[PDB]
Design an enzyme around this catalytic site. Structure first.
Site, PDB file in Angstrom:
ATOM      1  N   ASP A 167      -7.635   1.040   8.257  1.00  0.00           N
ATOM      2  CA  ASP A 167      -5.758   1.828   7.830  1.00  0.00           C
ATOM      3  C   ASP A 167      -5.642   3.038   8.980  1.00  0.00           C
ATOM      4  OD1 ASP A 167      -3.635   2.883   7.347  1.00  0.00           O
ATOM      5  OD2 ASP A 167      -4.031   3.009   5.356  1.00  0.00           O
ATOM      6  N   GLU A 174       0.346  -1.129  -0.007  1.00  0.00           N
ATOM      7  CA  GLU A 174      -0.158   0.018  -0.234  1.00  0.00           C
ATOM      8  C   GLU A 174       0.849   1.354  -0.455  1.00  0.00           C
ATOM      9  OE1 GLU A 174      -0.308   2.130   2.694  1.00  0.00           O
ATOM     10  OE2 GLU A 174      -2.074   3.385   1.435  1.00  0.00           O
TER      11      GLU A 174
HETATM   12  C1  MED Z   1      -5.999   6.528   6.203  1.00  0.00           C
HETATM   13  S1  MED Z   1      -5.424   7.411   4.906  1.00  0.00           S
HETATM   14  C2  MED Z   1      -4.228   7.715   5.526  1.00  0.00           C
HETATM   15  C3  MED Z   1      -3.412   6.701   4.294  1.00  0.00           C
HETATM   16  C4  MED Z   1      -1.674   6.439   5.397  1.00  0.00           C
HETATM   17  N1  MED Z   1      -2.258   5.033   6.529  1.00  0.00           N
HETATM   18  C5  MED Z   1      -0.248   5.409   4.437  1.00  0.00           C
HETATM   19  O1  MED Z   1      -0.553   4.327   4.688  1.00  0.00           O
HETATM   20  O2  MED Z   1       0.650   6.535   4.459  1.00  0.00           O
HETATM   21 ZN    ZN Z   2      -1.651   3.025   5.993  1.00  0.00          ZN
HETATM   22 ZN    ZN Z   3       1.075   4.798   6.018  1.00  0.00          ZN
END
Ligand code: MED
Ligand code: ZN
Ligand code: ZN
Ligand code: CA
Length: 277
Positions: free
Chosen positions: A160, A131
């Site tokens: 997340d 991700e």
């Molecule tokens: C929940 S949107 C924020 C994105 C952040 N979790 C990243 O993984 O960079």
């Molecule tokens: Zn994240």
């Molecule tokens: Zn992140």
């Protein structure tokens, strides 16, 4: 839905912390701490009765993985998914980002088995790779999910960053039924919520949302600063980031608010149960 035991969620975080320490300090794509994280989560799911799939992709010249876990049973035509990215940036262990979501989704999946639950909808959980490279694992999954299977998705729930030490309680303002279910859980706790705006589309729900799958999710804030009004409604420290260790080496076991992690893990299980009936 069952309560999710906070201690169990914390124990997954301890295991991810040790995995980072044993693997160069991180759990990043293309680095051994990521695949070791995958192996930990998969073994728990396999022992609980899930049918797991390791979905491999290549990005940046390096092999990545998504871990997909299908709970046998339920209507194949109505699939409810929940997921969380399992990679960190390479600067640290990524315990809040996103050990927190990964651990809540894993403990909810284990809770289904412990409770002997037979949801009406088929449940499928996912831990996404890469991700931090730009949603590469969730894009890979959606891009490789045939349209006939995409149409069977009743929803995708995303978790997340749900343990931020100076938390807010943000609920995605996407599918109305999913959003209502999360906000109903928090109303039972008398904890107000706000619409998620800080992260927007920047997480693994975006590839699903963009192809018309209903989505929703929970978030406790990242590098933005908590306002005076937010500290009044939630406590913590106005003028400090929700997560002072966002993408940092200090995103360690000390970078978790236990109350937020507990509340959001419990809300994840509440929503998964309610939306799969
Ligand atoms: C929940 S949107 C924020 C994105 C952040 N979790 C990243 O993984 O960079
Ligand atoms: Zn994240
Ligand atoms: Zn992140
Ligand atoms: Ca709990």
């Amino acid at each position: 839905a069952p309560d999710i035991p906070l201690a169990n969620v914390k124990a997954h975080l301890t295991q991810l912390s040790t995995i980072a320490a044993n693997n160069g300090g991180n759990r990043a794509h293309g680095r051994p701490g990521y695949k070791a994280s995958v192996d930990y989560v998969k073994a728990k799911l396999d022992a609980a009765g899930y049918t797991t799939t390791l979905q491999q992709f290549t990005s940046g010249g390096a092999t990545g993985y998504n871990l997909i876990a299908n709970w046998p049973g339920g209507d194949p035509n109505k699939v409810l998914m929940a997921g969380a990215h399992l990679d960190s940036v390479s600067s640290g262990a990524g315990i809040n980002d996103n050990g927190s979501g990964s651990a809540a989704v894993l403990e909810t999946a284990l809770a289904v088995s412990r409770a002997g639950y037979q949801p009406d909808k088929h449940l499928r959980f996912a831990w996404w790779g890469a991700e931090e490279l730009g949603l590469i694992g969730s894009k890979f999954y959606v891009n490789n999910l045939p349209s006939a299977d995409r149409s069977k998705l009743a929803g995708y729930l995303n978790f997340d960053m749900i343990g931020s030490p100076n938390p807010g309680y943000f609920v995605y303002d996407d599918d109305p039924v999913i959003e209502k279910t999360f906000k109903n859980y928090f109303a039972g706790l008398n904890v107000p919520t706000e619409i998620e705006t800080e992260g927007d589309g920047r997480s693994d729900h975006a590839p699903f949302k963009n192809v018309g799958v209903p989505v929703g999710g929970l978030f406790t804030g990242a590098g933005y600063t908590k306002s005076a009004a937010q500290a009044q409604k939630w406590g913590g420290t106005a003028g400090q980031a929700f997560d002072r260790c966002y993408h940092s080496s200090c995103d360690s076991l000390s970078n978790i608010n236990d109350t937020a992690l507990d509340r959001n893990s419990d809300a994840a299980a509440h929503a998964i149960w309610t939306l799969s009936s």
